[PDB]
Structure formats: C-alpha cells, structure tokens
C-alpha cells in the first residue's frame, strides 16, 4: 500500500506540475488590487496566478498572520484562490460578524485533515483496508466523515485507546506544520487518481460531469488528496487542537457504512479543561444525532 | 560612605542586565472592532474615538455658546 | 542589507539600549507595535528610526514583500559629551555630563528565525559522552 500511495502521489505531483506549467506558461499578466478593508488600499503588480495572501504579506505581517479568508468582488474565496486582472480584496476573519464561511471552511479542513490522519495510521498496519466515502458537512456545527473498511475491521472492535492514538497522531500532524496545497486539475486525470476509491469515482462521475466546469480543485495535504468545492484552512498553525468523538454504522441497500465524527477548535482558543470535557460530551451527543 | 574600589565590567553587566530582566514584553496589541486599527488591549481606540471626542467637544462648545 | 543611522541626538545610551535589545531579532511588525506602545523616551526615536528604515527599504531596495523584512541587528553607540556646571552647596561645583547616543539599525531580508530552545537531556547525554571519550 506504500508503493501505490507513493505512485499515486508521484502521479499527482506530476499532473499538478504539468497543469501548473501549462497554466502559468505565460508569465506576463497585469494584476490590480484595489479596495477598502480598513480604509482604502490601492496596489498594482505584474504576475500570473497571483495570490491574495501574498498581498496580505505585502501589506504587513499582522494582517498576514490574521488572514483567514479573502472576499473578492463580493464573492468569498480562499486565500490561496488565484486572482486575475482587477480585483477588490477584503480580509475576512473569525472575529468578524460573518462566521459562516470560515466555519464551513473549518469543518471541511477538519474532515480532510483526519482524511490524511486515518490513512497514515492505516499505512502503519498493512492488515487494514480503507475506502473513502463522501463527507457530509453540517451547518449545526458538525461534520461527518464517511468511510468503509475491510471485513477484519468489521470483526475487530474500535477500542478507546485506538481513537486516542488517532487523536495523538492528529495533533502530531498538527504541530508538524505542513502547508496545504491547492491544485487545478481536469476531471480525467482526477478520475485516474481516484480510481482506487469507488465512492469518489461515483461522486466525480455523477456530480462533476453535470457541472459545466471541467476544472476541479484538488487539495493536497501530505500524501493525502481531497476534493473540495470551497475554501480551505490557511495553515496547520491555525488549528490548535482536534478530537475523535465517536463512530456510527449505517445499513443501506445491504451495504454497511462507517461514519467517524469529531470537533475542532477555532482561533487557537479554549476556555478551560472543564468546558473541554463538556465539549467532548457535546461532541459525542452531536455524533449520536447524525444530522442530515 | 565611599566605594572601596572601581567596579569591573563583568559585575556591572551581570548587575545591570540579568536581575532587572530588561523590559518584559507582553502582548498589548489588539485590532479595533471599528476601524481595524491596531491599539492597546482593554482600552478604547485612538483613531475613531479621539476625533469623535474632539467633535463632541466642539459641538458642546458650540451648544454652550449658542445657549448663552 | 538596509542600514540606517541617527547621530548627534541627546538621550541616555543605557536607557535607549533597553529598547534597542527589545527589537533585536524581532520582526518589523512586532517591533513597530512594541516601540509604539512601549513607554520610554527611546520609544519614539527608535520608532522614527524604524519607520525611516522601512521607507528606505521600500523605496531604495524596492522590496517586493514587506513581510520578508525583519530586524537583524540593532545597536547604540556613544557620541560626544556636553559638559555643564551643576551648582552645589558651600561654593562647590560638580560636573554634569550630558550624554549622546548614536543609534544604528541593520536590516536583512528573509523570514526571521531564532531558536533559543535547547534540550537538556540530549545536550547532557551528548556532551558527557563526548567529554568522557576525550
């Protein structure tokens, strides 16, 4: 499973390098960024596939480190979202009155993150087998990560120490400080990469083919790749803590589905350890609910 | 009283640096909820308030001059 | 590298050195905020020096990203001394020396990296085993 993951990561890196090469082949472009977040700001630079986060860096280190999301021409985008021609750049943060976008992005980042973690733990033991299902976001403050496993994992029970170890590895990758990557790829090469995952194949085939856009955004964290229609968390330093609350088993059309669920911590801030235990209980209860 | 001998450099440095801890640096910096300017924690902004306080002082002086 | 200097300004060197060591190794932003909200006579001056250093960095060196600038080195020298007469009792005059401080600031591009972390167990187990083999 290590050779297949290394070959898939090498094929994804070659496809990302080829797409990036063919898209950035012309390095002559005009990027004008003008808008008022704080009072007015006017800047003009020449680059292709320009990053608004680099403009945040251009302003100062403070607004840079406090940058979470980027509102462009009224449309909310990730800070890694490339800009072209004239654009109006606004900096959206958690403390702002509109938590929704950064919240959704946060939950989708947490789902992805564990998408990597579980896989890495499953790369520790060759006995286990993992197949990723689609993820279900919940605006109630929940996120559900769906997956299916080998029969051996169906026979063997998920002891508490296990999930604790998953949490430890999650925090490990959290303080490892690994930057997220944003790739623009065709549905074809993507289909080829996701061939080993049936649910993702069905996802792309059914949903993405109906969509007029053949350009899909692949978010890469470590050796893990995920499909996202929306913004991602800026860095690994943004997420202070993570926890694994509980799992569920659903039976549909004579098929079994294993759904893992947990919670996340915004703006690197926790009130106390008591309210943390309370957050554990709340987490598990929200897992028992399984909102849809 | 009077000093017995001249102070060495080492003693002077160790005395003037370590125990005083120079100037301890905490974080007083917070972003203003209104204008987004950087100001001190647990304190009113120095941008969107001082101008409104000067405008309120000019309005109070104009009202006190119009009432008299 | 971007250098900036201020001479023939009258302030206590020992007092200015307090805010001089304060911004040493620190990034431009944090140093700016600090010097802004730091309370002393050197705060304003070193703030001016830093601001001018940033202006020179942007205009002269044409730096692409301002976030890639940090403070690599800061130092305070002593200039000439102005001798004044302090009148004391019983017909005696003491000498009041008015000092001067020459502030020097050296900036280098790139991200700031400073590690003061040192593992005690690793350093001990290494230095002891290397000293016992020498």
């Amino acid at each position: 499973x290590x050779x297949x993951x290394x070959x898939x990561x090498x094929x994804x890196x070659x496809x990302x390098x080829x797409x990036x090469x063919x898209x950035x082949x012309x390095x002559x472009x005009x990027x004008x960024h003008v808008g008022k977040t704080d009072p007015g700001t006017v800047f003009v630079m020449n680059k292709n596939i320009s990053t608004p986060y680099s403009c945040a860096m251009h302003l100062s280190e403070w607004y840079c480190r406090k940058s979470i999301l980027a509102l462009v021409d009224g449309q909310p985008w990730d800070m890694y979202k490339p800009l072209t021609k004239s654009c109006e750049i606004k900096f959206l943060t958690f403390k702002d009155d509109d938590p929704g976008e950064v919240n959704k992005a946060y939950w989708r980042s947490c789902a992805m993150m564990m998408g990597c973690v579980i896989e890495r733990a499953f790369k520790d033991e060759y006995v286990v087998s993992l197949v990723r299902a689609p993820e279900v976001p919940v605006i109630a403050g929940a996120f559900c990560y769906d997956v299916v496993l080998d029969k051996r994992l169906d026979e063997w029970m998920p002891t508490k120490e296990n999930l604790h170890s998953f949490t430890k590895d999650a925090r490990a990758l959290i303080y490892k400080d690994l930057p997220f990557e944003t790739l623009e790829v065709e549905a074809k090469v993507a289909l080829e990469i996701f061939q080993h995952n049936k649910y993702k194949l069905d996802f792309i085939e059914e949903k993405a083919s109906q969509n007029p856009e053949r350009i899909v955004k692949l978010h890469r964290f470590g050796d893990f790749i995920d499909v996202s229609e929306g913004p991602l968390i800026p860095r690994t330093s943004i997420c202070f803590q993570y926890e694994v609350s509980a799992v569920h088993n659903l039976q549909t059309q004579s098929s079994l589905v294993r759904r893992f669920q947990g919670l996340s911590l915004p703006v690197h801030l926790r009130a106390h350890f008591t309210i943390w235990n309370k957050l554990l209980e709340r987490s598990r209860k929200m897992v028992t609910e399984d909102k849809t | 009283a009077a000093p017995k001998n001249r102070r060495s450099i080492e003693v002077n440095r160790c005395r003037r640096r370590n125990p005083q801890k120079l100037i301890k640096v905490k974080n007083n910096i917070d972003v203003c909820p209104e204008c987004g300017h950087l100001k001190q924690k647990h304190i009113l902004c120095g941008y969107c308030x001082x101008x409104x306080x000067x405008x309120x002082x000019x309005x109070x002086x104009x009202x006190x001059x119009x009432x008299x | 590298e971007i250098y900036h200097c201020r001479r023939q300004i009258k302030y206590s060197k020992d007092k200015m050195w307090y805010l001089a060591k304060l911004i040493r190794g620190m990034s431009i932003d944090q140093a700016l905020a600090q010097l802004e909200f730091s309370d002393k006579k050197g705060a304003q001056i070193i703030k001016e020096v830093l601001l001018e250093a940033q202006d020179m960095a942007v205009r002269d060196h044409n730096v692409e990203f301002r976030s890639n600038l940090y403070v690599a080195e800061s130092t305070s020298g002593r200039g000439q001394y102005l001798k004044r007469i302090r009148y004391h009792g019983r017909g005696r005059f003491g000498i009041m020396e008015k000092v001067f401080c020459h502030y020097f600031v050296k900036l280098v591009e790139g991200x700031x990296x400073x590690x003061x972390x040192x593992x005690x167990x690793x350093x001990x187990x290494x230095x002891x085993x290397x000293x016992x083999x020498x």
Binding site: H272, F273, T274, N277 | - | -
Partner: protein, 208 residues
C-alpha cells in the same frame, strides 16, 4: 484525627458556673477525602482533606488541578490540604465528612496563616526597647542601634533585624473545644486563632 476549617469570628460565652470564656468560631463549608498515600519509614500514612468554595474553578486554570478534580470525581474546590495519620486502623478511603467529627471538651491545635504586617521595623518584631525620644537623641528613636562586636567582623547568622513579618504558617497549642454544631457546621474553640476572618485554618488533635 483532624479537619480543615475556615475562620469565622469570635464571641464570649457564659457557662452555668458564671465564668466568662472568650472563644472563636471555625466554620466548615465542605470536606472530602481525595488521595490516600501509604508510607513505611514515616510509620504513618497521609490523607487529603479539602475545603472548596467551588467558585474558583473558572478563574483558577491548570492541567493537573482540573484533571485531578475530574478524575477523582471531585467537585470544584478552593483549598486542598494534606493531613498526617499515624493510626492505620482509623484510615478510610475517599469519603465526604461533617463537622460533627469534633467533640466538646477536647483540646485541639490550630494551624493557620499569621496576620501579615508587611515590612516592619526592628520594633513590633523582636520587641526591642529602642532609644530615648529626648535628651539630645538624634534620629535614633526607632533605630535598633549597635549590632555586633569589634572582635568578630561579620554579624552572627540569625541576628534580629527589621524585615517582613507575618503571612506565615503558625500552630496554636492547647485550645479547648467548648461545643460543636453539626447542622450549622460550626466549631467553638477556646483560644486565639492565627490570621483574619475568612482565612483558611486547620483543626488538629493536640498533644497532652
């Protein structure tokens, strides 16, 4: 045999004999046994006595503290103290307790924090006489005066000099208990107690 208490106040009492007795009141808010630590060389085992205010939980934040309260199943507590138990037969596992544990007529020792006087002169500490306030005495009035002798250069260690006084642990001995109230959790103790009211105190079995 002993428990941790909280200083309430003082008040006179009238015995049927007609003799006046000045006593102090020690209130018991809450008591719980937390940890039991057995020992060998000391020939005695330690127990944990705890009096909580339950309010301090949020404004006092620590990993070990909160994890201790949570893992032990103990409610939020303000003050955690230890007690040395010599007798191994009377030792019990973690249990909540009441102020009925004390009986009238029993002499007890009271360990509390002495009133802090802050920085104090040579007077009020060692109770020196000082110098005269008259007869040509200049600025020597509250001064300690001479210290050492010409023979020995350095001053002897432990020499009495002005400094910080109070805010330290002290144990008063030979304090008789006239009576106890179980329902109101009040202890009547004849004697004086160290520190101001509302300060944490300790009631223990005396030695007679």
């Amino acid at each position: 045999v002993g428990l941790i208490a909280l200083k309430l106040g003082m008040m006179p009492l009238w015995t049927k004999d007609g003799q006046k007795h000045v006593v102090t009141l020690l209130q018991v808010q809450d008591c719980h046994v937390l940890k039991y630590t057995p020992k060998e060389n000391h020939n005695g085992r330690m127990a944990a006595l705890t009096v909580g205010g339950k309010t301090v939980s949020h404004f006092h934040k620590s990993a070990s503290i909160l994890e201790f309260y949570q893992e032990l199943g103990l409610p939020p507590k303000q003050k955690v103290k230890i007690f040395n138990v010599t007798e191994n037969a009377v030792i019990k596992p973690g249990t909540p307790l009441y102020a009925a544990h004390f009986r009238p007529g029993q002499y007890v020792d009271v360990t509390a924090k002495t009133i802090g006087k802050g920085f104090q002169g040579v007077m009020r500490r060692w109770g020196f006489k000082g110098q005269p306030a008259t007869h040509g005495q200049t600025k020597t009035h509250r001064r300690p005066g001479a210290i050492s002798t010409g023979d020995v250069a350095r001053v002897w260690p432990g020499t009495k000099m002005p400094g910080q006084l109070g805010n330290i642990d002290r144990t008063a001995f030979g304090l008789k208990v006239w009576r106890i109230n179980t329902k109101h959790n009040i202890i009547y103790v004849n004697g004086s107690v160290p520190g101001h009211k509302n300060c944490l105190v300790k009631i223990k079995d005396s030695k007679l």
